[PDB]
Design a protein around this ligand. Structure first.
Ligand SMILES: CC(C)(COP(=O)(O)OP(=O)(O)OC[C@H]1O[C@@H](n2cnc3c(N)ncnc32)[C@H](O)[C@@H]1OP(=O)(O)O)[C@@H](O)C(=O)NCCC(=O)NCCSSCCO
Ligand SMILES: CC(C)(COP(=O)(O)OP(=O)(O)OC[C@H]1O[C@@H](n2cnc3c(N)ncnc32)[C@H](O)[C@@H]1OP(=O)(O)O)[C@@H](O)C(=O)NCCC(=O)NCCSSCCO
Lengths: 308, 308
C-alpha cells in the first residue's frame, strides 16, 4: 500500500522485458568495446542491456513528441527533414566502475536499430582543463572533481546539440598523456541520440547544467569498497599495460612491485577518487533514471528504475 | 550564435501565442479568484494566462504518451479507461507574490477545455505541521521554511496521485486560525492534472522530492524589494480585513496604526519571509519551466520559458 517513484528489479525479472529485441551484437565486437577489468559477456548484454535499449527506444519517440509540442506552441515549424530534438543520455559512475564500457555498449545496441539512428558518444574527460590551466587553478590534485572540468563549455556543447545546431565541437583527451590533446577535437553533427559519459555529468548546481538536459540518465553503481579493489587491480594490471609505454604520464609506476603499487594506488584512491565519489557522484544516484548495480564480480544482477 | 535553454519574452510578443484559445472566464468569476492586492484583469488573462494554458494543454498530451511508453516497457496494460498518469504542475514564489491567485486562475483556465479535464488545486500549506508539533521542533519562528512542512507526507501524497491511486488525502490549513484544521482533510481522486502551489514546492534535496515529480513548474517572480511593500500593504490592509475578526490568530494587529504595523511587518519580513525567500525559494527559479515576472504594479509583463 506504499507507492514509489522507483521499481526495483533483480536481473532474473528484468531480463524478461527484452521481448523480441534482436541481439545485433557479436562476441567479437563485444570484446572490442570491453574495458580493462570489465567481464561483460553476451549473456549480460541480452539480459541487462537489451531490455534497457528497448526501454530507451520506446522513450525516444515519445520524448521527441513532447518537445515538438513546445515547438508547436512557439509557432515554430519542424522545417527540413523534421530534425527532432536530439535525445540526451547521461552515463555516470565512479572512476573504475565500468561506465566507460556501459556507454560504448549502449551506443552500439542503441545504434543497431532498424530505423538506423545516429548515436554519438562523448566522454566528458575531453572537457577537463589542460593540465596547465589545471595548476593555474591549483586543481591537479582534484582532477576528476566537478571543478576540474569546463562546465560552461560542456553545458554550451550539449545545449548547442540539443538546440538543433548543424554541428558542435568538443576537445579530446589523452589518457596515456594524461592531458588534453592540442588542436584535437571531436565533432558532433545533429545526432538522434547523444550519450554523455563521465564522473560528474549528473551533478547539479545553482545554474542549469547538462544534467538538466538529459532525457535519460544511467548510473553505474558498485559497493564503494568493491570499486577500490577494481581500481587497484586495474592499477597493477596497467603496470604491464598502458603504463609500460614510456609515453605514459605514469610510466614511473610500471617498475612498482605488487606491494608498492597497491600501496600507491590505495592512497590515491583515499585522497582523490573516493572523496570525489562520496562528495559529488553518489549524491546524484537517487535522481538517475536507471541504476545498474554491479556485484564484486562486475556482474550487474540488480537494477532500480525511475518510473516517476 | 549563442544557444540557450531559455526563451525570453515580453508580454507583447508572448500574447500572440494565444492563437484561437477561447476565453472561457468572466470578469465576475475572475474577482472570485483574485487575491488581496492582486490587480489581475481579463486583459492579462488573455495576454498572459491563455497562452500559458495553450502551452500546458499541448504538453499534457505528449507527456502522458511518454509515461505510457515506460508502462509499455513494463508489460503493464493501460487497463480500465486509460487512466493516464496525472500531469503535475508546481507553482512557487514568495509569500505575498501572487502565486495563490496565479494557481487558482490556471486551474480555472486549464479546467475549461472542450475535453473537460479534471484539474485539482492543492496548496502545500496544508502540509505544514500543526503549530503544536511546530514548537516541539522549535520552528514557529521558521514557519514557511522547508522544515516547517511534512515533506515525507507531501511527497507520499503527490507520489500516490501520480502513481495512479484511486484517491489520496491531504490535511487542510486555516489561515485565520494560523494552524492546521483538526480532522479536516482534502481529497484528490485521480485528476488529469494536479496543481501544487506553495513556497518551497520546487525545493530540491538529497532524496527525490515533489519537485522531481512535476511535469511543469511555474515561478512567480518580483523585485524582492517590491514584494516587501506588497506584503506590508497587505498587512495594513488586512488590519481592516481578515484580522479584524477576533478569531484571527493575529487580531492583536488590527489595533495597530499605519506606522506601528508597517514597523511590525517590515521586521517580520526581515526576520522570516525575506530569509526564506532568499535562502530557499529564489534558488529554484532557474529550473522553473516558466517564470512570470511581475512589475511593482503586479502586472506580469515579462516571462522566461524553458524550452530545454
Ligand atoms: C581522469 C580520471 C579521473 C579518469 O576519468 P574517467 O571518466 O575516464 O574514468 P576512468 O578512469 O574509470 O576511465 C578511464 C578510461 O580510460 C582508461 N584510463 C584511465 N586512466 C588511464 C591512464 N592513466 N592511462 C591510460 N589509460 C587510462 C581506463 O582504462 C578507462 O578505459 P576502459 O573503459 O577501456 O577501461 C583518472 O584517470 C584520474 O586521473 N584520476 C585522478 C585520480 C587518480 O586516479 N590518479 C591516479 C592516476 S594513474 S591510475 C589510472 C586508472 O585510474
Ligand atoms: C503561512 C505563510 C508562510 C503563508 O504561506 P502561503 O503559501 O499561503 O503564502 P501567502 O501568505 O502569500 O498566501 C496566503 C493566502 O492566504 C491569505 N493569508 C495569509 N496569511 C493569512 C492570515 N494570517 N490570515 C488570514 N489570511 C491569510 C493570503 O491573503 C493569501 O490569500 P490570497 O491569494 O486570496 O491573497 C504566512 O501566513 C506566515 O505565517 N508566514 C510566517 C512569517 C509571517 O509572514 N508572519 C506574519 C504573519 S501575519 S501577516 C499575513 C500575510 O502574510
Amino acid at each position: 500500500s506504499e507507492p514509489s517513484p522507483y521499481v526495483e528489479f533483480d536481473r532474473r525479472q528484468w531480463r524478461a522485458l527484452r521481448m523480441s529485441t534482436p541481439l545485433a551484437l557479436t562476441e567479437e565486437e563485444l570484446v572490442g568495446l570491453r574495458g580493462l577489468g570489465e567481464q561483460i559477456d553476451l549473456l549480460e548484454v541480452e539480459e541487462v542491456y537489451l531490455p534497457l535499449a528497448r526501454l530507451i527506444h520506446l522513450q525516444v519517440a515519445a520524448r521527441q513528441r513532447l518537445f515538438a509540442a513546445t515547438a508547436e506552441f512557439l509557432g515554430e515549424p519542424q522545417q527540413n527533414p523534421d530534425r527532432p530534438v536530439p535525445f540526451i543520455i547521461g552515463v555516470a559512475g565512479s572512476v573504475a566502475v565500468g561506465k566507460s564500457t556501459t556507454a560504448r555498449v549502449l551506443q552500439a545496441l542503441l545504434a543497431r536499430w532498424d530505423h538506423h539512428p545516429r548515436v554519438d558518444l562523448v566522454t566528458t574527460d575531453g572537457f577537463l582543463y589542460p593540465n596547465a590551466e589545471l595548476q593555474r587553478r591549483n586543481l591537479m590534485h582534484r582532477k576528476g572533481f566537478p571543478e576540474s572540468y569546463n562546465r560552461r563549455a560542456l553545458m554550451r556543447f550539449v545545449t548547442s546539440v540539443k538546440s538543433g545546431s548543424d554541428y558542435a565541437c568538443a576537445p579530446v583527451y589523452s589518457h596515456l598523456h594524461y592531458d588534453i590533446i592540442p588542436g584535437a577535437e571531436q565533432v558532433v553533427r545533429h545526432p538522434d541520440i547523444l550519450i554523455l559519459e563521465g564522473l560528474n555529468v549528473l551533478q547539479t548546481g545553482p545554474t542549469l547544467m547538462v544534467s538538466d538536459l538529459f532525457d535519460f540518465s544511467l548510473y553505474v553503481d558498485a559497493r564503494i569498497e568493491d570499486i577500490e579493489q577494481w581500481y587497484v587491480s586495474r592499477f597493477l594490471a596497467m603496470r604491464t599495460t598502458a603504463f609500460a609505454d614510456p609515453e605514459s604520464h605514469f610510466h614511473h609506476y610500471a617498475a612498482f612491485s605488487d606491494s608498492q603499487a597497491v600501496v600507491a594506488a590505495r592512497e590515491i584512491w583515499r585522497t582523490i577518487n573516493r572523496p570525489n565519489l562520496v562528495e559529488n557522484i553518489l549524491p546524484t544516484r537517487p535522481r538517475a533514471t536507471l541504476v545498474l548495480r554491479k556485484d564484486a564480480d562486475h556482474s550487474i544482477n540488480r537494477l532500480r528504475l525511475r518510473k516517476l
